[PDB]
Amino acid sequence: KVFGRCELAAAMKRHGLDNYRGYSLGNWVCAAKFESNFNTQATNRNTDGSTDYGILQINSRWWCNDGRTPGSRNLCNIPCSALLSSDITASVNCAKKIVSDGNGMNAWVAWRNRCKGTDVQAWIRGCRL
Numbered sequence: 001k002v003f004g005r006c007e008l009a010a011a012m013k014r015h016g017l018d019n020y021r022g023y024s025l026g027n028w029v030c031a032a033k034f035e036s037n038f039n040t041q042a043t044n045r046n047t048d049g050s051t052d053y054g055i056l057q058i059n060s061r062w063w064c065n066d067g068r069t070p071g072s073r074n075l076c077n078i079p080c081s082a083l084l085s086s087d088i089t090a091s092v093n094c095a096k097k098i099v100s101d102g103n104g105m106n107a108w109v110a111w112r113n114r115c116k117g118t119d120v121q122a123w124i125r126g127c128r129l
Contacts, residue, residue, distance in 0.1 A: 001086040003038040003055070005029065006127040008088075013129050015092040021099050025129070026120030031111035032056060033123065040091075041084055054083035054091045056108065063094055 003011070009029050012018070018025035035057040036042035044052045050061040050069045058076075060069040066080035076094040083091050098107050105111050 001040045003032075003040070005033075005038070005123070006129075008032060008038055008055075009124055009127045010129055011088055012092065015089065017092060017095075018129075020096065021104070023099065023105055024120060026123045027105060027111065027115060029123040030115035030118075030120050031105065031108045034110035034114045035108055040086055040088065043084070051080070053080045055088055056083075056091050056095050057110070058083050058091060058094055058098070063098065 009025060012028050013025055017023070017028045032038055032055050036055045038055065040055050042054060042057065044057060046052065046059075048061070050059055050072070051066060052059050053064065053066075058064060058080075060066045060072055060080050062073045063076045064078050064080040064083060065072065065074040076097060078090060078094065083094070099105055101107065105116070
């Protein structure tokens with residue numbers, strides 16, 4: 001499923017991401033835009049044998065099990081396929097654990113490269129939240 005910008009914003013707000021750990025909703029919507037372009041089916045295979053899954057591109061090396069990543073840990077206790085569903089609950093709960101893993105939102109390289117330091121409030125424009 002491909003979310004509309006405000007549609008995703010509402011969904012995330014609904015799952016408690018707005019201001020979570022001090023990160024405004026805009027940051028989260030912006031991360032999603034550049035990590036997967038709001039596509040819940042998005043996947044990216046890395047060169048280290050791992051793969052990023054879903055709307056927030058969560059990595060299989062440590063956060064989920066896809067049964068084909070060497071020395072992989074499943075800290076979120078879920079199959080990576082669950083991060084490719086139209087319901088973002090799984091991705092959000094797992095994201096909540098990653099953003100609290102000691103690096104803030106820097107865990108998402110796309111967020112770091114395209115959202116960090118910018119006027120992320122714009123990503124929420126026109127939304128009736």
